[PDB]
Design a protein around this motif. Structure first.
Motif, PDB file in Angstrom:
ATOM      1  N   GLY C 252      15.594 -16.616  -9.956  1.00  0.00           N
ATOM      2  CA  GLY C 252      16.802 -17.957  -9.051  1.00  0.00           C
ATOM      3  C   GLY C 252      17.481 -16.726  -8.701  1.00  0.00           C
ATOM      4  N   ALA C 253      19.481 -16.512  -7.977  1.00  0.00           N
ATOM      5  CA  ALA C 253      20.137 -15.645  -7.944  1.00  0.00           C
ATOM      6  C   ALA C 253      21.119 -16.287  -9.086  1.00  0.00           C
ATOM      7  N   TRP C 254      22.554 -15.535  -9.168  1.00  0.00           N
ATOM      8  CA  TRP C 254      23.555 -15.988  -9.901  1.00  0.00           C
ATOM      9  C   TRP C 254      24.563 -17.241  -9.336  1.00  0.00           C
ATOM     10  N   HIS C 255      24.356 -17.656  -8.671  1.00  0.00           N
ATOM     11  CA  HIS C 255      24.580 -18.693  -8.679  1.00  0.00           C
ATOM     12  C   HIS C 255      23.829 -19.733  -7.035  1.00  0.00           C
ATOM     13  N   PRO C 256      23.869 -20.453  -8.158  1.00  0.00           N
ATOM     14  CA  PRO C 256      24.153 -21.562  -8.789  1.00  0.00           C
ATOM     15  C   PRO C 256      23.202 -20.819 -11.003  1.00  0.00           C
TER      16      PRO C 256
END
Lengths: 131, 52, 386, 242, 136, 100
Positions: C252-256
């Motif tokens: 994943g990424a930092w957002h979400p």
RNA sequence: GCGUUGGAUUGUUCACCCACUAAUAGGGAACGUGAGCUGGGUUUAGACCGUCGUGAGACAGGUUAGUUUUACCCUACUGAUGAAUGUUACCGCAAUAGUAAUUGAACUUAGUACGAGAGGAACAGUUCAUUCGGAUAAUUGGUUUUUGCGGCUGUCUGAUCA
RNA sequence: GUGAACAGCCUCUAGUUGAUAGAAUAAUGUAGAUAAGGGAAGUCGGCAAAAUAGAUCCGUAACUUCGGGAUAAGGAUUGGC
């Protein structure tokens, strides 16, 4: 499957086979074709010094004297003694094409046999003189 | 090329269902319904043996 | 960034969640509609899958490059004994769904369907329909009421059937119940058909015939808790990465700041319920018929059961359906054969096959003989023969 | 002198075989190519849809004249059975085993004289002369190795590919006993045997074959009933330009 | 398929990927061919475009005439040595890899082809079938 | 369909069984199974391997020369299919197996 | 809605060439992405060169060598059980949430329609393939602790046997 | 004992049988392997792994301070009785 059989017996690294080598000794033309080949740059002995039984090029003329005196080359002489096992030996075992198979065993016993045994007997006299 | 749900092919395929390929099914649904009527008559004959 | 190199997604989001199904018999989700002029016709049938075998065939396909030539391909053989009717259910249309309202049972039931209703057969006093069969007294008079409720109401009528597991060499003794809809018109003629088949068995050829396109549904081959690389098809990380190489690197990424529902995690593989459609019946054989495996060509009296039988299964001495390809599910499991759900358009669903040779060599090893008469002919005689 | 196209290929001798008493056609797709033979030949000779070893290239696998038909080793038993059912008893049909399979590239012949590849064995050379009833000569056209692809024959005359020397034409016509012209077909294809089929009363070639090239082919096979082939001198005006 | 290829090409196993040295069968004057690309190939991340029996691939000569060398030109594969599938019941494979060089029309360059040409290639390219001494 | 035998095994090879090899000399080597195929790769000799049939016909086992073993040869003239030939060949092949 | 690549030089993105292909569209998510990695580059101590400095030393000028730590916790997410509805058993209904297929060729139509000329289409009918997906083990391939069978080297049980 | 050998492997005299254990064989690991066709297209980089190896005989280049380079490269052979 194993390690060692894959090293020597791939399809890339395959020798000629025991069928075609018997046909080369069957006549006097292809004996003198393979001995007196034209020189070719890709080939190891520069298209010279070739053993007919073991389809293998030798580098130097001294490398034939050591090759003909050995248990490797005496092996291939004993291998080429009998009927050379074509497809017709396999089908005659099932009960299929006897008279096709029986004529071939009749010819190789009478005609092609002592003619091949004369051609090998002149190779051992020819390689004796040049070496 | 044209996708699966395009309006051109689905209009083209609807005509073939009006024609040949429904006739083979309606021929098929008559032959199978014949054997299902002969499924009862074989199984009523074995019930007649016990009536003996 | 913008991913720098586009690639199609791994896995199909239509089949979520990947989880273990509820039972080893998959329920059928939807039936062919209703052609209400036709005779009464059972929509589906249920049998037991047994192995695979090879079929050659002279391909009668105009237009192809293999027109009028021989084609070898693989088929499945599903053991299909006759199936006996024990019940009738009607469904009333609501503005909530289809609500069942009436079951009617068939005055006396086999020992198998009473075994379906218990989990400890050897301890139970076996009191399954004993107070129910007493309600078939002087004229019944309740069953004639509960039939007439279906005749008045109940827009669709489904028929409870069960199998004949005692005839199958599979050793499990307990039959499976199923619901199968009827497609004949005029529901009084639906329900008067099924009243005349109580305690009565329905064959296989009375539901299918050859050259028909069918679809089989089953539960597919549990493999247990399985990692991502073989579950979704994620590429392997190269070599000696710290903490593993059979996994997804970036999740994943930092957002979400939540792991998304579509990032190929690890879990269950197999034992799902699937529907695979357009499977073509080649051969409907019969158990009483000797020489099932003999074609019009071969003229050798032999049954499709190979030498030493199928592997992990007994013998096909029953009715069978040979269908091409590969039905989902494994050997000795239960499949359900629906019929086509719509009129099929392509020319492939119309061709009449003619099988030229059926293989029956042994599947427990490298099968080289069709019949045991071949082997004793080819081997010659032995020490133990004389 | 008919232009005909297999599916979109100008090659005809690959895809069809034509002798004086029969014809052989492939089975691919639809009956447009088969109809064009029924336009010319009529009902007078059998025309056979057939496959050789499950292929479509039946003109280069087989070889024969009006007397016999030779199929290679890989011809299956059903396809060998299918040929005898159609063709009458006057033709001999025999499966031949060799090293090399494609008999069409290797054997070019008329009803009377055949030519073979040099590497062909003499145990087949005896069989060719016995089945086809012809003589056999071992020869190469202009030092090109395949005499069936690069030469086309009939009893009327013969056509060779343009690399043939003029000295080579005079030597080779004594063997075949027919006149010989260097020519091209289908706009400059060297492979003149595969481009066209010809017997003593019909020639079928590709659509790409131009009208100067039909003038050469109609001349040397003498396709009109009052042609002594000497009108090629009258047709020399087409030859100097083209 | 593409231009020059008559009919459709059925599915056979992918034997020759990018960077595969294969023998040069004909008498054009080259000794070996080096595959750099396969026409009619797909597009997928990190796949290598793999050739098969009877495909027109771009191939540079590594060893041969200097006239043929150092220029890219098409080549048609005629022998595979990977086991592929015929639709009658056999899997077969040849002894080595081989290719003959061609124009983009699909016409041959030399006169002769030594060794057996594959049956799947011989249906596909007629000009290869014209020069094929030995089929299968 | 051509029930051809193994090149090494002399056992019948049904359609969809074994590998074929094709030599540069363009004869076909159709093999019974993977056991026989890897023995051919390793250049072994079927006259010496005891379990094959080519050993047994050679080394004084199961008989080689017989009258019934000559019927099955091959035919290269396709005799045009009368039925009453084919009806008796079904009686012929049933009888030859009873005598062999 | 669905696809958008394989390679060459550089730590480099960028850049340009070769080649396939229907096309090689543009951007965001802490210029996405380190208890996910890599350490190639950047960013300590060792050291050589060039310039500057009387000198210690400076130069982010050039080039070599250089420690990469933790999840068992809560939550998210992929999976797996379960108290409570009189008990227990079978057959079902569908609220909601998810959704999947994709492009390229070929025969036929046709060398027809169209053309001051050569050149040179499509819809209906039909067959295959490319990318993706879901399964399955007939066959072929791969895998072997069935250590199933056989063989071989050194040694040990007096030798054979095992 | 095998062998060039106090190498490695097995054994005799002598000593130890101590290192928490029992049942099952999911994922991911750490340690050790094999793989059809192609052979570095992977990558900062052939990292790693594969290949070669003991021995007798034939044969050995540029260069060189004339000592070397050199096991250069390369090629035939090996059991048993």
């Amino acid at each position: 499957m194993g390690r060692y059989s894959v090293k020597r017996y791939k399809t890339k690294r395959r020798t000629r086979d025991l069928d075609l080598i018997y046909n080369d000794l069957s006549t006097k033309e292809s004996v003198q074709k393979l001995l007196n080949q034209p020189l070719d740059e890709t080939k190891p002995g520069l298209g010279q010094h070739y053993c007919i039984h073991c389809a293998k090029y030798m580098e130097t003329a001294i490398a034939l004297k050591t090759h003909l005196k050995g248990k490797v080359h005496k092996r291939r002489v004993k291998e080429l003694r009998g009927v050379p096992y074509t497809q017709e030996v396999s089908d005659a075992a099932a009960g299929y094409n006897l008279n096709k198979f029986l004529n071939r065993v009749q010819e190789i016993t009478q005609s092609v046999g002592p003619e091949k045994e004369s051609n090998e007997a002149l190779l051992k006299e020819h390689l004796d003189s040049t070496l | 090329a044209k996708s699966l749900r395009a309006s051109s092919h689905l209009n083209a395929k609807s005509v073939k269902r009006r024609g040949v390929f429904q006739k083979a099914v309606d021929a098929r649904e008559q032959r199978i319904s014949d054997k299902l009527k002969e499924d009862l008559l074989k199984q009523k004959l074995e019930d007649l043996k016990k009536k003996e | 960034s913008h991913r720098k190199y586009e690639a199609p997604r791994h896995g199909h989001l239509g089949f979520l969640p990947r989880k273990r199904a509820a039972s080893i018999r998959a329920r059928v989700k939807a039936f062919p509609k209703d052609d209400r002029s036709k005779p009464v016709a059972l929509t589906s049938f249920l049998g037991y899958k047994a192995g695979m075998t090879t079929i050659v065939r002279d391909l009668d396909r105009p237009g192809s490059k293999f027109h009028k030539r021989e084609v070898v391909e693989a088929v499945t053989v599903v053991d299909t004994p006759p199936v006996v009717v024990v019940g009738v259910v009607g469904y009333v249309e609501t503005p909530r769904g289809l609500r069942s309202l009436t079951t009617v049972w068939a005055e006396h039931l086999s020992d198998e369907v009473k075994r379906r209703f218990y989990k400890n057969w050897y301890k139970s006093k076996k009191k399954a329909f004993t107070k129910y069969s007493a309600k078939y007294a002087q004229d019944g008079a309740g069953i004639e009421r509960e039939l007439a409720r279906i005749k008045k109401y109940a827009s669709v009528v489904r028929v409870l059937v069960h199998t004949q597991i005692r005839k199958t060499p599979l050793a499990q003794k307990k039959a499976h119940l199923a619901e199968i809809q009827l497609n004949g018109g005029s529901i009084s003629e639906k329900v008067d058909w099924a009243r005349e088949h109580f305690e009565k068995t329905v064959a296989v050829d009375s539901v299918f015939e050859q050259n028909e396109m069918i679809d089989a549904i089953a539960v597919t081959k549990g493999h247990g808790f399985e990692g991502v690389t073989h579950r979704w098809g994620t590429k392997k990380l190269p070599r000696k990465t710290h903490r593993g190489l059979r996994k997804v690197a970036c999740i994943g990424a930092w957002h979400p700041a939540h792991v998304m529902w579509s990032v190929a995690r690890a879990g269950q593989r197999g034992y799902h319920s699937r529907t695979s459609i357009n499977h073509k019946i080649y051969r409907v054989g019969k158990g009483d018929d000797e020489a099932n495996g003999a074609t019009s060509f071969d003229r050798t009296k032999k049954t499709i059961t190979p030498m030493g039988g199928f592997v992990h299964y007994g013998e096909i001495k029953n009715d069978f359906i040979m269908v091409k390809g590969c039905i989902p599910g494994n050997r000795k499991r239960i499949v359900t054969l629906r019929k086509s759900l719509y009129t099929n358009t392509s020319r492939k669903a119309l061709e009449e096959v003619s099988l030229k040779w059926i293989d029956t060599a042994s599947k427990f090893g490298k099968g080289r003989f069709q019949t045991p008469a071949e082997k004793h002919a080819f081997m010659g005689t032995l020490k133990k023969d004389l | 002198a008919t232009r005909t196209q297999f599916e979109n290929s100008n090659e005809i001798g690959v895809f069809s075989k034509l002798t004086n008493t029969y014809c052989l056609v492939a089975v691919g797709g639809s009956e447009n190519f088969y109809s064009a033979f029924e336009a010319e030949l009529g009902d007078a000779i059998p025309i056979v849809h057939t496959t050789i070893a499950g292929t479509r290239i039946i003109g280069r696998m087989t070889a024969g004249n009006r007397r016999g038909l030779l199929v290679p080793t890989q011809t299956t038993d059903q396809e060998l059975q299918h040929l005898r059912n159609s063709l009458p008893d006057s033709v001999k049909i025999q499966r031949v085993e060799e090293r090399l399979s494609a008999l069409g590239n290797v054997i070019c012949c008329n009803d009377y004289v055949a030519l073979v590849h040099p590497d062909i064995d003499r145990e087949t050379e005896e069989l060719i002369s016995d089945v086809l009833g012809v003589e056999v000569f071992r020869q190469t056209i202009s030092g090109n190795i395949l005499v069936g692809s690069y030469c086309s024959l009939s009893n009327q005359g013969g056509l060779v590919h343009p690399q043939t020397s003029v000295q080579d034409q005079e030597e080779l016509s004594s063997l075949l006993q027919v006149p010989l012209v260097a020519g091209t077909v289908n706009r400059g294809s060297s492979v003149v045997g595969a481009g066209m089929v010809v017997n003593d009363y019909l020639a079928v070639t590709g659509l790409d074959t131009t009208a100067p090239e039909l003038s050469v082919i109609e001349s040397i096979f003498r396709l009109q009933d009052a042609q002594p082939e000497s009108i090629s001198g009258n047709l020399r005006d087409t030859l100097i330009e083209t | 398929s593409g231009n020059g290829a008559q009919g459709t090409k059925f599915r056979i196993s992918l034997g020759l990927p990018v960077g595969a040295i294969m023998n040069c069968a004909d008498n054009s004057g080259a000794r070996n061919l080096y595959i750099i690309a396969v026409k009619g190939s797909g597009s997928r991340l990190n796949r290598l475009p793999a050739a098969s029996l009877g495909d027109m691939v771009m191939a540079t000569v590594k060893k041969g005439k200097p006239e043929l060398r150092k220029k890219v030109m098409p080549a048609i594969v005629v022998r595979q040595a990977k086991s592929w599938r015929r639709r009658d019941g056999v899997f077969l494979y040849f002894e080595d890899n081989a290719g003959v060089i061609a124009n983009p029309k699909g016409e041959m360059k030399g006169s002769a082809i030594t060794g057996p040409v594959g049956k799947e290639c011989a249906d596909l390219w007629p000009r290869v079938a014209s020069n094929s001494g030995v089929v299968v | 369909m051509r029930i051809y035998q193994c090149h090494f095994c002399s056992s019948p090879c049904y359609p969809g069984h074994g590998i074929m090899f094709v030599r540069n000399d363009a004869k076909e080597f159709r093999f019974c199974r993977s056991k026989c195929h890897k023995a051919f790769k390793q250049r072994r000799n079927p006259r010496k391997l005891k379990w094959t049939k080519a050993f047994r016909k050679a080394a004084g086992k199961e008989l080689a020369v017989d009258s019934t073993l000559t019927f099955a040869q091959r035919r290269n003239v396709p005799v045009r299919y009368n039925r009453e030939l084919v009806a008796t060949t079904l009686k012929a092949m049933a009888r030859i197996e009873e005598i062999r």
